[PDB]
Design a protein around this ligand. Structure first.
Ligand SMILES: *[C@@H]1O[C@H](CO)[C@@H](O[C@@H]2O[C@H](CO)[C@@H](O[C@H]3O[C@H](CO[C@H]4O[C@H](CO[C@H]5O[C@H](CO)[C@@H](O)[C@H](O)[C@@H]5O)[C@@H](O)[C@H](O[C@H]5O[C@H](CO)[C@@H](O)[C@H](O)[C@@H]5O[C@H]5O[C@H](CO)[C@@H](O)[C@H](O)[C@@H]5O)[C@@H]4O)[C@@H](O)[C@H](O[C@H]4O[C@H](CO)[C@@H](O)[C@H](O)[C@@H]4O[C@H]4O[C@H](CO)[C@@H](O)[C@H](O)[C@@H]4O)[C@@H]3O)[C@H](O)[C@H]2NC(C)=O)[C@H](O)[C@H]1NC(C)=O
Ligand SMILES: CC(=O)N1CCN(c2ccc3ncn(Cc4cn(Cc5ccc(Cl)c(Cl)c5)nn4)c(=O)c3c2)CC1
Ligand SMILES: [Ca+2]
Ligand SMILES: [Ca+2]
Ligand SMILES: [K+]
Ligand code: NA
Ligand SMILES: [Zn+2]
Length: 806
C-alpha cells in the first residue's frame, strides 16, 4: 500500500497500517514503501571513497559520499577522511587510554554500540588474530575476557535475547531456535513470520528498559537483505541526528561467521575470509566514529552468542534405532533433543517407557535422556511450558534425529553441513567472546570468564538505567568498568537464629532410635561444653554464618567438628559447615555405631526426625550432612550421629554421597591445602530454580512430616593461593560447588554398576554449580564475613568450575 520513503529512510519510529514503512525492519514484513529500495538502499559506486571522488559534487544516487559537505550531512563513506584528508585508519593509531568521555557538545551520555557476531567461537580471538587487526585492537586496548559462557541451548535466538534481557531462556521464553507452545498451539522458527508475534518474547529487553527511562534506543533486529555496509552507515547517520532525536544505544548484528561455520566447520579453510570481512566491518565502524569525533566517546561491546563445533551428518544418532514406536513421538532434533507425544492429549503415551528405551542402550551412546527436572540445575532449563518433559543432552560433535529419512534427503543423501552448535553451555567449542572498549570500560584489562546473563546489568549501568529484575548478579561485573554507578550491598537477614542450650532429657524422646553410646574426667568435660557453645566455630565457619533471607524458625547448633543451621520447619539443617585440613585423617564408622542415631538434647522431640519413619519407609534411608568419617576424635564422632545431622537419602544416592564424603572431601583437602565445606538439602519440586515453601513439598518420608530433598548441595571453598591453608588464608578465595539430584536410581550414570571410583566424580562434575545457584535454591546468602570486597565476593558466587580443559 501507499506512501513514499522520501525524507524517511531508516526512520526510528515504526508507522502503523495502512501507511507503508521505511524503518530497518520493513523488508522483513514485506511492508516497505515502493521507493524504499530506490531511496534507502542506494549502492552506486560502492562503499569506499577513492582519490578521484574527493571533493566531488554531491550525487544523491551514491551509496555514500566523498563531497566536501558530507561530514556536515553525516553520510560520508567511512574511509572519507583517510583517503581525502590524509587521516589514518583507526586501527593504525596507537592505543591511548580513554580516561574520560570525549564527546561533542550536546551528548548527554556516552552512546553504547553493541556489535554482535553470530557463531564467533572464543578461540577465534587467538586463532584468527592475524586476519582481524581491528578486533585485536579493541581486544588488547579495551577490557576482554578469555571467553564468555553462553546460555543453554547454545543457539542464536535464546542467546541474543538472553543478552538483551539478562534472563535465562526458561524465563524470557525463547527456549530454542525452534519451539512449540502447547497453549498457542503454534510453532516458532528462525525462518518465518510467527517469531514476529510479541506473544513469544517475555522479560524486558534493553531497548524497552531504555525507552521507559527516557533513553532513546535503536532497533536491535535487522532485515537480512540490508548489507552490513549499509547497517554501519545507518548507525553513523543516526549518530548525526539532533540531540533530542538521537538514540543513545545501537546494535549491529552480523550473521557471520555462523553462516559459513555451518557449511565449513569452525576452522575450515573457508573461514578465514568471513573473519576478514567482519574485521573490515569493525574498521568501517571505528573509522566512521573517528570521523564524527566519537571514537573516544562511545562505548563499544563486541560480543558473540555462541561458538561452533565440528558436526557432520554421519555423526547422527537415530531414535528409530532405540524405539520400536518412533511414529508416536515428535522430536525437536539436532544438537539437543526435545520429545513430546505426536498426538496431543493422547493418554496412551508413556514418557517413562520412552526414557527407559533411551537409557544406556548402546555402549558409546552419544546422547543421554533426562526428564527436564533432572537436567543439571546449572542449565536452568525446565520452568517453561515450551520445554518438553523429555530432553536429550547430546554429546559434542553429534546430532540426534528421529529417523534416517530426516537426515538423508532425496536424491541419494548428500550432507553439506560441517559445523553446528546448541550443546551444553560448558562445552569449550560453544564458548564465545566479549570485548568492551570505550571511556567507561577499563584500559588494557583482562577479566575472568563470565556468563552472558550478566551483561544486561552492565549495559544498563553504561546507560544510566535501572535494570529490570533479571538473573544477573548486579555488581559481579563491576571489575569490568572504570566508573561504576552501582554499589552492591548484601541482602538483609530476615530470620535470626535461635541458640538453644540443653533443654530436654533423653527420656523425653520417643524417636525409635538406638545408639551404643553409653561407653565410659573434669578436664575434658569443660572442653566438651566449650565446643557445644561454639569454641571451635571460627575454624569451621570461616566466612560467617549464612544469612537466612526468608521468614522461618531455625537453630544454630555448635559441635567440635561442624556447625549447622537447623530448621525446625523442615526438621533438618538448611546448611552444615565444617573445615577439613590437608592433614585431616579419614576414619571408619566403628562397628558398634553402624546404625547409631542419637537424640539432640538441644532440640525438642517435636522438632526432630525419628528413626521409625525410616524403618517403615522401605524406599528411603538416611545419611548425614557432616560425615562421621571425618570426625576429629572417637569422642567427637558421636556428634555426627545426632538426629539433627541426619537427612533422608535413597540407597542409590547414598552410594554417591558416601563416596563424596569418605573419599572426595579428603582428596580435595589434600589438593587444595584444606577445604571448608558447606552442605545441605534443596527442595525444588516445581523445578523453578527457587527455594520451595513448605506447602510445595510433594514427598515425605513415609508416615512423617520429614520432607524429601530433591537435591543435595555442597560449596567447597579454599585459598586461591594454595600455599596458604584454607583456614589461614589472607587473600582471594577459590570455590567449587555442586547440586546433586537426589534420585532413587543411578540410571543417569551408565557405569554405575562399577565401583564408585569409576563414576561418582563424573556425575558430580556434570552437576557443578555456582554458589548463586544454590543461593536461589535455598534462600541463603553465603560469604557474609570475609576480608574481601563485596564485588569480589559477587564474582566468586557467580564462578562455575566447568572441568573442561584449557
Ligand atoms: C530469573 O529472573 C527472573 C526475573 O526476576 C525470575 O522470574 C520471576 O520470578 C517470579 C517468581 O516466580 C515471578 O513472580 C510473579 O509472577 C506473576 C506476574 O507475572 C506476569 O507479570 C510479570 C511482570 O511483568 C511486568 O514487569 C516486567 C519487568 O520484568 C515487564 O516485562 C512486563 O511487561 C510488566 O510490566 C512478567 O514478567 C511475567 O512474565 C512471565 O509470563 C509471561 C506470559 O506467560 C511470559 O511471556 C514471560 O516469559 C514470563 O514467563 C516466565 O515466568 C512465568 C512466571 O511468571 C513462568 O510460568 C514461565 O514459564 C516463564 O518462566 C508475567 O507476565 C505474579 O502473578 C506472581 O504472583 C503469584 O505468586 C506469588 C509467589 O510466587 C504470590 O506471592 C502471589 O500472591 C501470586 O499468587 C497468585 O497467583 C498464582 C498464579 O501465579 C496462584 O497460583 C495463587 O493461588 C494466587 O492467586 C509472581 O509474583 C516473575 O513473573 C518472574 N519473571 C520473569 C520475567 O520470568 C526468575 O525466578 C529468576 N530465576 C532464577 C533461577 O533465579
Ligand atoms: C521482541 C520484538 O520486539 N520483536 C519480535 C521479533 N520481530 C522481528 C521482526 C523483524 C525481524 N527481521 C529480521 N530478523 C532477523 C534478525 C536476527 N537478529 C539477531 C538478533 C538480534 C537481537 C535479538 Cl534480541 C535476537 Cl533474539 C536476535 N537480528 N535480526 C528478526 O529476527 C526479526 C524479528 C520484531 C519484534
Ligand atoms: Ca547464533
Ligand atoms: Ca521451587
Ligand atoms: K528405610
Ligand atoms: Na546406572
Ligand atoms: Zn548457527
Amino acid at each position: 500500500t501507499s506512501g513514499s520513503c522520501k525524507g524517511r529512510c531508516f526512520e526510528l519510529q515504526e508507522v502503523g497500517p495502512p501507511d507503508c514503512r521505511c524503518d530497518n525492519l520493513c523488508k522483513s514484513y514485506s511492508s516497505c514503501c515502493h521507493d524504499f529500495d530506490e531511496l534507502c538502499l542506494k549502492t552506486a559506486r560502492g562503499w569506499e571513497c577513492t582519490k578521484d571522488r574527493c571533493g566531488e559534487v554531491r550525487n544523491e544516487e551514491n551509496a555514500c559520499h566523498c563531497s566536501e559537505d558530507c561530514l556536515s550531512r553525516g553520510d560520508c563513506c567511512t574511509n572519507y577522511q583517510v583517503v581525502c584528508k590524509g587521516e589514518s585508519h583507526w586501527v593504525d593509531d596507537d592505543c591511548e587510554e580513554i580516561k574520560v568521555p570525549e564527546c561533542p557538545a550536546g551528548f548527554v551520555r556516552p552512546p553504547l554500540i553493541i556489535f554482535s557476531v553470530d557463531g564467533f567461537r572464543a578461540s577465534y580471538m587467538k586463532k584468527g588474530s592475524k586476519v582481524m587487526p581491528n578486533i585485536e585492537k579493541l581486544r588488547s586496548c579495551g577490557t576482554h575476557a578469555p571467553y564468555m559462557r553462553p546460555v543453554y541451548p547454545t543457539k542464536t535466538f535464546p542467546n541474543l535475547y538472553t543478552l538483551a534481557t539478562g534472563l535465562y531462556p526458561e524465563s524470557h521464553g525463547i527456549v530454542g531456535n525452534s519451539m512449540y507452545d502447547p497453549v498457542f498451539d503454534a510453532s516458532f522458527h528462525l525462518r518465518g513470520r510467527e517469531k514476529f508475534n510479541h506473544r513469544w518474547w517475555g522479560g524486558q529487553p534493553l531497548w524497552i528498559t531504555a525507552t521507559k527511562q527516557g533513553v532513546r534506543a535503536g532497533t536491535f533486529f535487522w532485515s537480512v537483505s540490508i548489507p552490513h555496509e549499509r547497517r554501519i552507515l545507518t548507525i553513523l547517520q543516526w549518530l548525526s541526528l539532533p540531540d533530542n532525536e538521537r538514540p543513545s544505544v545501537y546494535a549491529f548484528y552480523s550473521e557471520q561467521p555462523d553462516f559459513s561455520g555451518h557449511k565449513y566447520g569452525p576452522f575450515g579453510p573457508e573461514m578465514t575470509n568471513p573473519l576478514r570481512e567482519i574485521d573490515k566491518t569493525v574498521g568501517q565502524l571505528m573509522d566512521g566514529l573517528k570521523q564524527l569525533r566519537l571514537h573516544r566517546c562511545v562505548n563499544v561491546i563486541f560480543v558473540g552468542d555462541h561458538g561452533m563445533e565440528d558436526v557432520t551428518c554421519d555423526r547422527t544418532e537415530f531414535l528409530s534405532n532405540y524405539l520400536t514406536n518412533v511414529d508416536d513421538i515428535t522430536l525437536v532434533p539436532g544438537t539437543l533433543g526435545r520429545i513430546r507425544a505426536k498426538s496431543i492429549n493422547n493418554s496412551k503415551y508413556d514418557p517413562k517407557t520412552i526414557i527407559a528405551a533411551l537409557t544406556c542402550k548402546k555402549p558409546d551412546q552419544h546422547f543421554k535422556p533426562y526428564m527436564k527436572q533432572h537436567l543439571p540445575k546449572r542449565l536452568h532449563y525446565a520452568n517453561n511450558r515450551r520445554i518438553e518433559d523429555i530432553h536429550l543432552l547430546v554429546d559434542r560433535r553429534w546430532h540426534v534425529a528421529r529417523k534416517p529419512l530426516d537426515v538423508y534427503k532425496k536424491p541419494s543423501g548428500k550432507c553439506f553441513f560441517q559445523g553446528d552448535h546448541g550443546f551444553d553451555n560448558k562445552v569449550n567449542s560453544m564458548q564465545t567472546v566479549f570485548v568492551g572498549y570505550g571511556p567507561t570500560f577499563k584500559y588494557r584489562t583482562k577479566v575472568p570468564p563470565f556468563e552472558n546473563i550478566e551483561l544486561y546489568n552492565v549495559m544498563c549501568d553504561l546507560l544510566g538505567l535501572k535494570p529490570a529484575p533479571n538473573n544477573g548478579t548486579h555488581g559481579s561485573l563491576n571489575h569490568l568498568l572504570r566508573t561504576n554507578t552501582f554499589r552492591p550491598t548484601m541482602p538483609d537477614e530476615v530470620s535470626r537464629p535461635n541458640y538453644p542450650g540443653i533443654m530436654y532429657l533423653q527420656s523425653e524422646f520417643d524417636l525409635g532410635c538406638t545408639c551404643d553410646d553409653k561407653v565410659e574426667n573434669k578436664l575434658e568435660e569443660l572442653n566438651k561444653r566449650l565446643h557445644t557453645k561454639g569454641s571451635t566455630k571460627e575454624r569451621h565457619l570461616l566466612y560467617g554464618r549464612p544469612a537466612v533471607l526468608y521468614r522461618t524458625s531455625y537453630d544454630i547448633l555448635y559441635h567440635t567438628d561442624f556447625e549447622s543451621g537447623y530448621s525446625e520447619i523442615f526438621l533438618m539443617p538448611l546448611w552444615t559447615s565444617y573445615t577439613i585440613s590437608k592433614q585431616a585423617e579419614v576414619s571408619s564408622i566403628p562397628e558398634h555405631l553402624t546404625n547409631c542415631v542419637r537424640p539432640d538434647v538441644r532440640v525438642s522431640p517435636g522438632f526432630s526426625q525419628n528413626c521409625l519413619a525410616y524403618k517403615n519407609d522401605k524406599q528411603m534411608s538416611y545419611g548425614f550432612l557432616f560425615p562421621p568419617y571425618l570426625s576429629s576424635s572417637p569422642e567427637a564422632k558421636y556428634d555426627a550421629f545426632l538426629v539433627t545431622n541426619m537427612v533422608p537419602m535413597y540407597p542409590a544416592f547414598k552410594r554417591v554421597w558416601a563416596y563424596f564424603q569418605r573419599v572426595l572431601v579428603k582428596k580435595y583437602a589434600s589438593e587444595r591445602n584444606g577445604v571448608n565445606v558447606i552442605s545441605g538439602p534443596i527442595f525444588d519440586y516445581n523445578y523453578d530454580g527457587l527455594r520451595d515453601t513448605e506447602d510445595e513439598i510433594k514427598q515425605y518420608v513415609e508416615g512423617s512430616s520429614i520432607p524429601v530433598p530433591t537435591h543435595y548441595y555442597s560449596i567447597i571453598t579454599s585459598c586461591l593461593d594454595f600455599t596458604q591453608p584454607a583456614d589461614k588464608c589472607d587473600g582471594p578465595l577459590s570455590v567449587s560447588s555442586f547440586i546433586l539430584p537426589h534420585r532413587p536410581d543411578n540410571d543417569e550414570s551408565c557405569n554405575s554398576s562399577e565401583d564408585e571410583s569409576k563414576w561418582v566424580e563424573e556425575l558430580m562434575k556434570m552437576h557443578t554449580a555456582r554458589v548463586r545457584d544454590i543461593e536461589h535454591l535455598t534462600g541463603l546468602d553465603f560469604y557474609r564475613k570475609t576480608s574481601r570486597s563485596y564485588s569480589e565476593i559477587l564474582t566468586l558466587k557467580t564462578y562455575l568450575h566447568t572441568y573442561e580443559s584449557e
